[PDB]
């Protein structure tokens with residue numbers, strides 16, 4: 001059965017609720033982004049209306065084989081009427097195609113669902129500035145003060161310089177980047193760009209990337225591994241065993257691997273700076289774990305919520321334990337008392 005935080009009161013709408021069969025009363029199913037916990041249950045046999053961004057729609061069609069007739073793509077930053085209710089989709093600053101959804105209820109209530117997001121001060125000058133929000137359905141992935149990490153810009157600087165230095169010292173070095181879903185493409189794109197290379201990958205991943213409306217993508221990626229010195233591999237394969245095995249396959253083209261594992265937060269954050277991060281090393285192979293997040297830090301989240309001043313907050317992540325729920329409500333109350341709403 002569909003949980004309460006996936007239902008929108010006073011509508012026939014659900015959000016990211018595809019793994020429960022047919023939901024009684026649902027006239028339209030919203031999908032915020034193309035990540036598997038969120039699309040879980042969609043397939044080519046689905047026969048209800050799906051509302052989403054253009055990019056999420058390209059991926060539903062080509063990767064999941066959902067039929068064209070049930071795909072309703074909406075432009076961003078645009079007031080749209082769906083089943084007689086006004087809605088707006090806004091960029092979530094998560095992965096490609098990810099959105100937040102504003103719902104204007106027929107009774108005058110205004111709801112924001114964030115989907116997954118990385119809060120940013122630029123959201124404070126979207127269409128959110130222009131009216132009040134009564135309920136906030138919030139991505140609470142990192143809702144605790146210990147969850148710190150650098151900006152995406154700083155992480156990317158670190159990766160580019162690490163790669164450029166290593167390959168300038170040893171032109172026979174190969175760079176490998178891990179991936180298991182969409183998101184974080186800037187990591188491998190920025191490294192490839194500084195090395196004057198395209199990114200090589202499997203046919204299945206090249207297909208996924210072609211769905212994303214990235215400018216000049218055909219100049220940036222390829223299925224021809226041999227021509228490229230940046231390779232993507234499934235994240236599971238980013239270990240000494242996997243990478244050794246991969247180095248064999250390149251046929252004496254390369255004598256060293258430098259690899260990057262993008263993670264969310266890791267406890268190495270609580271002591272060490274991005275400047276100071278070191279790899280794990282075995283022989284001619286080095287693996288760097290880098291903290292490239294596409295979710296809000298605690299500080300980013302707190303700033304967004306204090307600016308929005310919602311009357312009620314409904315969390316959508318970490319909801320399964322009494323201790324998590326209780327911890328989150330405490331931070332909400334401090335935030336509210338500090339800012340005066």
Ligand code: NI
Nearest residue numbers: 033035094116
């Ligand atoms: Ni996500």
